[PDB]
Amino acid sequence: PLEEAFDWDEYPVQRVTATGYTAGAESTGKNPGDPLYGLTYSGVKVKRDLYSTVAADPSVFPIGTILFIPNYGLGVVADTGSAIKGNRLDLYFETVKDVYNEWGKKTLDVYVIKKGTGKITEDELEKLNETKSLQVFRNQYKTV
Amino acid sequence: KPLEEAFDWDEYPVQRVTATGYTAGAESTGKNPGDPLYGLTYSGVKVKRDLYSTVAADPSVFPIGTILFIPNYGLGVVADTGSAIKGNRLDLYFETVKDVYNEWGKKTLDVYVIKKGTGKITEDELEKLNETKSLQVFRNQYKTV
Numbered sequence: 001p002l003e004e005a006f007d008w009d010e011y012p013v014q015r016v017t018a019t020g021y022t023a024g025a026e027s028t029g030k031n032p033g034d035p036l037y038g039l040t041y042s043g044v045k046v047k048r049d050l051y052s053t054v055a056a057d058p059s060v061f062p063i064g065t066i067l068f069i070p071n072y073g074l075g076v077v078a079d080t081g082s083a084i085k086g087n088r089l090d091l092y093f094e095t096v097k098d099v100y101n102e103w104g105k106k107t108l109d110v111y112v113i114k115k116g117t118g119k120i121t122e123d124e125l126e127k128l129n130e131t132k133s134l135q136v137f138r139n140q141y142k143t144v
Numbered sequence: 145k146p147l148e149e150a151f152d153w154d155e156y157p158v159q160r161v162t163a164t165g166y167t168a169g170a171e172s173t174g175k176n177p178g179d180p181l182y183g184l185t186y187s188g189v190k191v192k193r194d195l196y197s198t199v200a201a202d203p204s205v206f207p208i209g210t211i212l213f214i215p216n217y218g219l220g221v222v223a224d225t226g227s228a229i230k231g232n233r234l235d236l237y238f239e240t241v242k243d244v245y246n247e248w249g250k251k252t253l254d255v256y257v258i259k260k261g262t263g264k265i266t267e268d269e270l271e272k273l274n275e276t277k278s279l280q281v282f283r284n285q286y287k288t289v
């Protein structure tokens with residue numbers, strides 16, 4: 001594939017943190033019908049292609065900057081965002097499902113603690129969450 | 145210390161799986177808020193993010209009620225299922241779509257800077273890049289035919 005087709009290490013390298021996004025309201029607060037729906041900060045339409053539109057911090061990667069992003073592809077800096085600051089990228093995908101599956105999808109090892117019986121109730125789930133020996137870890141997962 | 149290193153988890157059996165995130169929202173479930181069935185899992189339990197969170201899996205692999213420890217997510221109780229959740233597949237519940245984007249989808253990686261931009265980009269410039277002759281062989285893997 002493209003990752004192996006060229007010696008990319010001849011180009012400058014930048015460590016970044018990257019998430020995915022779509023043109024939809026969950027990312028942009030805009031919906032179909034809005035005048036600027038689907039349009040990046042630069043004015044060009046969002047695109048997932050050989051060269052895809054990506055979001056970055058203009059002070060780090062100016063608009064028009066061409067990047068190669070492993071496991072995503074070639075990217076042209078065309079968009080920006082309030083949360084997109086510093087060494088941060090946001091990668092355009094067509095659908096929320098694509099963000100979940102093409103960037104969010106992770107292969108990893110999980111530990112099987114107890115085989116289930118086929119049932120679970122609210123009471124049992126509450127009992128598990130009230131486990132005394134684990135309350136010290138609980139604030140790390142509770143939102144409230 | 146983090147839960148991920150507070151116990152010798154390798155004492156327990158290990159299962160390689162492919163995992164994604166989901167929410168109660170319509171993008172995942174097709175249900176809208178106001179629906180009395182909104183946020184209701186297959187097991188009849190309400191979706192929950194907590195010490196023990198509700199996760200989705202294939203019952204034939206992980207029966208309902210199965211407790212897992214998923215690194216960088218937490219302890220999970222299999223309480224949900226899904227048409228696409230088959231085989232060694234897990235779907236991890238998050239409260240919002242942004243949480244799925246940020247808390248699961250966020251990756252630290254190196255990218256290569258091919259060319260620094262001038263501060264402007266046009267549709268025609270982007271089109272010409274995508275029409276690069278020597279790269280049309282690679283284009284099938286990114287374009288959605």
Ligand SMILES: CC(=O)N[C@H]1[C@@H]2OC[C@@H](O2)[C@@H](O[C@@H]2O[C@H](CO)[C@@H](O)[C@H](O)[C@H]2NC(C)=O)[C@@H]1O
Pocket residue numbers: 021022023027028030036037038039040041046055079080081082083084090
């Ligand atoms: C919270 C946050 O930073 N959201 C970003 C996320 O990353 C890129 C994209 O989605 C971004 O949306 C773009 O915001 C810019 C600044 O308000 C707008 O000028 C762009 O038109 C908008 N892009 C699109 C495709 O709508 C969000 O602001």
Ligand SMILES: CC(=O)N[C@H]1[C@@H]2OC[C@@H](O2)[C@@H](O[C@@H]2O[C@H](CO)[C@@H](O)[C@H](O)[C@H]2NC(C)=O)[C@@H]1O
Pocket residue numbers: 166167168172173175181182183184185186191200224225226227228229235
């Ligand atoms: C595409 C797909 O499989 N989506 C899944 C995704 O993973 C778990 C959850 O979201 C799942 O939603 C649950 O579907 C089950 C039937 O398949 C229903 O019985 C559950 O009530 C439903 N869960 C919720 C919280 O609505 C989606 O079907």
